[PDB]
Ligand binder design. Sequence first.
Ligand SMILES: OC[C@H]1O[C@H](SC[C@H]2CNC[C@@H](O)[C@@H]2O)[C@@H](O)[C@@H](O)[C@@H]1O
Length: 332
Amino acid sequence: SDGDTAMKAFNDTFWDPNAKMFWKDSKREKHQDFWVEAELWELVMDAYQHTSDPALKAELKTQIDDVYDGTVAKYGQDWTNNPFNDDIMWWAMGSARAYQITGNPRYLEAARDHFDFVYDTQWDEEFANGGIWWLNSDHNTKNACINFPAAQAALYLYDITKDEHYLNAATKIFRWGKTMLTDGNGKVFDRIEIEHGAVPDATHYNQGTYIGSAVGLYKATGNAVYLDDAVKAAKFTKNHLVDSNGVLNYEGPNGDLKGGKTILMRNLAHLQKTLDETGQYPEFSAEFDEWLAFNIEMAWSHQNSDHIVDGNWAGGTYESWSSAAAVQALNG
Ligand SMILES: OC[C@H]1O[C@H](SC[C@H]2CNC[C@@H](O)[C@@H]2O)[C@@H](O)[C@@H](O)[C@@H]1O
């Protein structure tokens, strides 16, 4: 049970049962950033779905509710006072998943109300012919880190509700994003800035949410073009966001990007499952599976004696966001 071992060690090192939040690092001086906390929430959910130890499973199910409670105690229930639309949407997506797992109606209202605020008021047709703004304060840029997560959140809400409103939203957001925030061959651009144009800088987490939304659209629509879209973005990641031995890059020193492999790995697992089930792209599937396994083994060979792995997978304080990626990789 390497996935169980990895998750237990992550909790032992970083979980604060008193505040019901993760610590930012092993000094236990400061709790994790708001948007990153939603991604650690999803890690708890993924370990819950992966494990077959019923005692650990029940423990992780309780933790799903505690993570939300601790964040609500510090930040409130209404997140629309946060000027970052991406922060809001990461929590809306997490809330949709928490509803799928628990059935607790507070999570459905949280997902729906926050999705609606962003989509209904922060979509604009004028600048760049579409897209959602990064912030709800100033309107200067439209970014991959809000647009693709918004498509993914719409797809979860469609699965829950069967309301075509959400499928129509996902289709519209993704079409815009593919056209304005990619090169058409799987390279995902960070953002488009008013008075400048596209900033074509690719990162692990934006490759990830593009891939996850494309796989979700394939499943919901039956259009094979969406699967092709996801494969091209996975090939780009494997060939161009890696070191000379094929190990995924380290994206520091930026604090938001350092743990981005967590989001990438979560979404690559969705593509791997869809390829295994459909038997499509058999040649790429075999190469992709082998490359993933090589990455996981190299990462875990760098673990310390407490079973924690730093985010520099190619080589004394450990950080929760950087260290999460190796745990996610064993819970997919
Ligand atoms: O270059 C990393 C990253 O930086 C921001 S998103 C990160 C912010 C999310 N909201 C809370 C902030 O504290 C955080 O910096 C955006 O410029 C994004 O497009 C880019 O990829």
